[PDB]
Design a protein around this ligand. Structure first.
Ligand SMILES: [Zn+2]
Length: 1028
DNA sequence: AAAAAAAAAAAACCCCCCCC
DNA sequence: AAAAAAAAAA
DNA sequence: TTTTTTTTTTTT
RNA sequence: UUUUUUUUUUUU
């Protein structure tokens, strides 16, 4: 049984103080010149583990001190009673037993209420309790049955432990010593080398700010490594650990020796879903490293990541910042189209299936590759130290098995591991690209040979008979030195031939399996013919979504919870499918998706709140419903940003087949329109993007052909017969947009740099540029304030958050007219609300409470969610519109909520409570039903308590919507007390105790004043806060 | 000629919280 | 410019 | 009574 | 029960 630090122990004030004192004392006591900082760090970790154990034991003893004392007294009295019976001793025994039962019940209620508060704070939000609600129950890691090496089925713990340990030891023990072959392979193919500045940046001394940033960036609530220390320990005590972490990291920089804790890793085996649990090869292993080792590796990972752009070619998008996966996907699809359009088909797209690449990459080859790339000095020394003695131990069924060395393979669970693996695989990628005998596919002017995402490689080959054999030879040569072994039999490939005998010969000569219809790459079903891209990617997406909704048909959550479920599980899949294949989709797809989503959201019932209202912004109810058509439009138009930026690494944008206008996309956004050119006739992604961009620009009444962001090298200047040297000078000296040059009176007159640029340009180009820019039309079209759309697509040099910004802008643009239920409420109560009242009601809906159940109830009350007798009477085409519960009156929504004679007593009790709060709130239904207050009550010092009381009353009334009994004041007290308890424990957890007390003390006092002792006892109503 | 928006007509299912 | 959640891919 | 769907008209 | 990249949503 290993030791794991809990986050509850860290949050304790006394424990935190004692732990900080112990850390400071150890750092100022055991530091000397006879002990290295690595051994001192290991001793510090051990002492911290011991101190944490001692503090936890002390806390448990203190929490159980009363229980222990009462138990000892009870045992002594029982022994005395057995020795000699006495009535008074029996009375004492009974009293002690009653006190013990009361304390145990109080502790159980404490735990239950803490769990309930944690749940209710996230009841319907996009968070853990909802993700675990939709996800299938997690399979346990308790592996009791396995198939041994002799083919027998065994359940003996020793045999299964031995089998698993031996399998994972033999997996990581295949370390190669052929250094000469590694050197030969590295010298055979050219690799990039970092310059002096980048090497110095890598080898720069570590500073405190880097360690602080890495510690703050550590994800929370993550399983700790073998030492049991979580990231929360380092985040909470960073003010005391950062100096000693600096000392340790400088020591390891100078010496190249790491603490023994930096090597030990914990391997957890996950049973692969859909696979046999009795096979040793059907388990996914994951490695947990110590938090300090992860911090060091993350520092190194960031240091190498700041140069990974130069070290890694843009063909590899996995683990590379600023590179998205679909960069390859569309690219691959484009290649397929070019093959389908070729008159002579002699092509092959091979999906190379790497077999446990992370577990088979040779550490010596990785080190030699790092040395070859010019990475040397402190950084290389630290990396070599990391992989000098890596050791991992398997946690099987909660038991720590004997550790085995990681002789080969890259340490999983390491932040530096993905970048090192990319560096290693880049040698093979460049060898394939630099091999003249391995011919790629020529898409226009771009030769495409391979695309990469981590170890998932796709190779595009022309003339497969020779190209594929050369690729296999090169891959085998790379594997002989690096261990990057390929499961060829599992490498699905599309083979395009124009002759059956040629296809048969290629299949016979090559060991690659041939996929006739589809290949799964990055979760996308790439098709042999692009015309089936929909049929294999979006129709199966609809089928999967329908199956998921049918599985979630009886899920125990409300409509808000189901909307958040759609946003959490369904929305990312649809967004990813749109990003990978943004093709023109029929309205049938969107109609079916919307129908399925709406049926799931409303539990196969008719929508109580209009879809158009929820499709608006958060001001229209606070919940919002995902608009899939707007997300699709945003995804399609996103490519315009890459068009305008014109990155040299976005090769996918240059892979679109075309016969005319070879260079249009970089001259298409904020540029002169095409001169009646029928470009993109057979385009698959880009033409639809341009069409949607034009549609959005037309809807905005915007001119997208001459904007303030019109590039200097755009068609507007090139059509002036301006020499390319002048354009380059303008780009280098003034800026990138025509606004930087200036138009009208501002033409080359904004800066002395403009004077220099004018002096550096040929006079004819100056004359033509002045004629174009100083023209009235250009001046009025350029010198204008750009909108949010142009700013989104031009002013952002980074694509992070681009989809969200475009979607928000489209939702703002497509602000369809919707009915206002608050105005309907005003009509019901014979009142007129100003725009201030409407905004107040919307803000009350948005900010009703931290928990989502209270907000959902407030939204239901305000947005006319609840059904009324009038609605049912009209639906059933009958005159039985009399109000429910029996009053003989017409059952309007206002009457059922506020004006019912059987509901009036509850509101009168609420107003009596308000009077006891010294709040002269008028008996106005708008205040509780919509959150609309008169101008005389603009003070917010009492609005929180009033909101809690009103929402509790709304819950109580809704509970008895069609019951003949009146909404009971006791039920209202109980509901507001449940809210009080949940908010109390939430404020304790979230350190919001002061505001909670300020908003709940008077209400709690009024509650306790009007309740009898029996009611308080049987309803678990008792004081929870004091004078604090 | 095609797409988008607005208007009109038809249809539904007497509670509603609760439910990790 | 921070904190948290989830999902996608590997 | 409310929402969704279909049809018609208008604009590009 | 990891790590990296990217994405969305919510709270300022
Ligand atoms: Zn009534």
């Amino acid at each position: 049984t290993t030791w794991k630090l809990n986050n509850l122990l860290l949050n304790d004030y006394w424990v935190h103080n004692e732990m900080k004192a112990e850390i400071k004392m150890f750092f100022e006591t055991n530091e000397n010149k006879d002990t290295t900082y690595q051994n001192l760090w290991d001793a510090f970790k051990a002492v911290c583990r011991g101190k944490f154990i001692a503090l936890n034991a002390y806390k448990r003893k203190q929490e159980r001190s009363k229980i222990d004392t009462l138990t000892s007294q009870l045992k002594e009295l029982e022994k005395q009673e057995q020795t000699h019976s006495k009535a008074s001793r029996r009375q004492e025994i009974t009293k002690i037993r009653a006190e013990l039962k009361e304390i145990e019940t109080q502790k159980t209620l404490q735990k239950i209420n803490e769990s309930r508060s944690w749940f209710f704070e996230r009841i319907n939000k996009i968070d853990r309790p909802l993700a675990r609600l939709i996800k299938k129950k997690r399979e346990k890691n308790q592996i009791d049955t396995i198939k041994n090496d002799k083919g027998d089925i065994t359940t003996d713990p020793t045999e299964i432990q031995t089998t698993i340990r031996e399998y994972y030891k033999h997996l990581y023990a295949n370390k190669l010593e052929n250094l000469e072959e590694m050197d030969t392979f590295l010298d055979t193919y050219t690799l990039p080398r970092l310059n002096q500045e980048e090497v110095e940046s890598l080898n720069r001394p570590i500073t405190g700010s880097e360690i602080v940033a890495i510690i703050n960036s550590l994800p929370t609530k993550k399983s700790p490594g073998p030492d049991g220390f979580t990231a929360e320990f380092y985040q909470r005590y960073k003010e005391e650990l950062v100096p000693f972490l600096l000392k340790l990291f400088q020591s390891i920089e100078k010496e190249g020796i790491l603490p023994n804790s930096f090597y030990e890793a914990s391997i957890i085996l996950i049973p692969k879903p859909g696979r046999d649990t009795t096979k040793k090869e059907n388990f996914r292993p994951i490695s947990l490293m110590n938090i300090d080792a992860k911090i060091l590796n993350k520092i190194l990972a960031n240091r190498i990541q700041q140069h990974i752009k130069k070290l890694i070619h843009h063909d590899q998008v996995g683990f590379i910042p600023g590179m998205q996966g679909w960069f390859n996907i569309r690219k691959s699809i484009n290649v397929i189209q070019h093959i389908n359009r070729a008159k002579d088909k002699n092509h092959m797209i091979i999906s190379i299936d790497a077999e446990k690449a992370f577990d088979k990459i040779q550490q010596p080859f990785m080190l030699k590759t790092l040395n070859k790339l010019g990475i040397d000095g402190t950084y290389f020394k630290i990396i070599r130290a990391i992989y000098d003695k890596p050791t991992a131990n398997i946690i099987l069924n909660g038991q720590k098995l004997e550790a085995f060395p990681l002789k080969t393979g890259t340490r999983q669970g390491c932040p530096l591991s993905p970048l090192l693996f990319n560096i290693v695989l880049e040698v093979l990628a460049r060898a394939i690209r630099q091999e003249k005998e391995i011919k790629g596919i020529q898409l226009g002017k771009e030769e495409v040979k391979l695309s990469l995402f981590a170890d998932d490689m796709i190779v595009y080959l022309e003339n497969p008979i020779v190209s594929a054999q050369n690729l296999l030879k090169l891959i085998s040569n790379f594997s002989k030195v690096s261990g990057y072994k390929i499961n060829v039999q599992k490498s699905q490939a599309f083979l395009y031939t124009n002759n059956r005998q040629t296809e048969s010969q290629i299949m016979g000569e090559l060991p690659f399996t041939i996929a006739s219809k589809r290949i799964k790459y990055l979760g996308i079903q790439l098709t042999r013919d692009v015309k089936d891209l929909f049929k294999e990617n979006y129709k199966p997406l609809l089928k999967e979504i329908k199956e998921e909704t049918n599985k979630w048909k009886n899920i125990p959550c409300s409509w808000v919870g189901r909307i958040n479920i759609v946003k959490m599980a369904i929305l990312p899949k649809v967004i990813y499918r749109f990003n990978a294949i943004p093709i023109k989709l029929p309205m049938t797809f969107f109609t079916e998706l919307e129908k399925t989503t709406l049926k799931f959201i409303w539990n196969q019932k008719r929508a109580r709140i209009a879809k158009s209202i929820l499709s608006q912004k958060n001001k229209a109810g606070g919940i919002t419903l995902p608009d899939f058509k707007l997300y699709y439009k945003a995804t399609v138009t996103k490519t315009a940003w890459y068009w305008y930026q014109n990155r040299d690494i976005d090769q996918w944008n240059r892979t679109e087949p075309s016969e005319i206008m070879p260079h249009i996309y970089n001259y298409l956004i904020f540029d002169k329109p095409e001169k009646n050119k029928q470009w993109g006739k057979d385009s698959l992604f880009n033409k639809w993007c341009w069409e949607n961009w034009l549609a959005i620009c037309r809807k905005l009444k915007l001119d997208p052909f001459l904007t303030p962001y019109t590039k200097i090298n755009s068609r507007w200047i090139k059509d002036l017969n301006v020499k390319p040297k002048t354009i380059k000078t303008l780009e280098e000296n003034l800026g990138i947009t025509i606004q930087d040059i200036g138009v009208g009176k501002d033409f080359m007159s904004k800066t002395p740099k403009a004077m220099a640029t004018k002096d550096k340009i040929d006079k004819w180009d100056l004359i033509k540029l002045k004629s174009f820019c100083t023209a009235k039309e250009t001046t009025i079209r350029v010198n204008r304030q750009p909108t949010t759309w142009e700013k989104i697509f031009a002013t952002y040099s980074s694509d992070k958050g681009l989809i969200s910004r475009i979607y928000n802008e489209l939702k703002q643009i497509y602000k369809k007219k919707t009915n206002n239920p608050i105005k309907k409420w005003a009509k019901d109560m014979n009142r007129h609300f100003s725009k201030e009242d409407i905004y107040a009601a919307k803000k009350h809906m948005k900010k009703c409470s931290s928990s989502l159940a209270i907000r959902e109830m407030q939204i239901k009350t305000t947005m006319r969610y609840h059904l009324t007798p009038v609605r049912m009477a009209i639906i059933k085409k009958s005159g039985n519109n009399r109000c429910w519960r029996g009053c003989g009156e017409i059952g309007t929504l206002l009457h059922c909520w506020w004006d019912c004679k059987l509901v009036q007593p509850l509101w009168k009790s609420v107003w009596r409570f308000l009077r006891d709060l010294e709040l002269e709130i008028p008996f106005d239904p708008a205040i509780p039903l919509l959150g609309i207050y008169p101008n005389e009550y603009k003070s917010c010092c009492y609005k929180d308590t009033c909101t809690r009381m009103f929402i509790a009353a709304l819950f109580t009334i809704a509970k008895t919507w069609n019951q003949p009994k009146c909404p009971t004041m006791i039920d209202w007290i109980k509901k507001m007390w449940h809210i009080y308890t949940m908010e109390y424990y939430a404020a304790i957890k979230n350190d919001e105790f002061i505001s909670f007390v300020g908003t709940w003390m008077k209400l709690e006092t009024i509650i306790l004043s009007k309740l009898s002792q029996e009611q308080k006892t049987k309803h678990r109503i008792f004081s929870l806060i004091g004078g604090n």
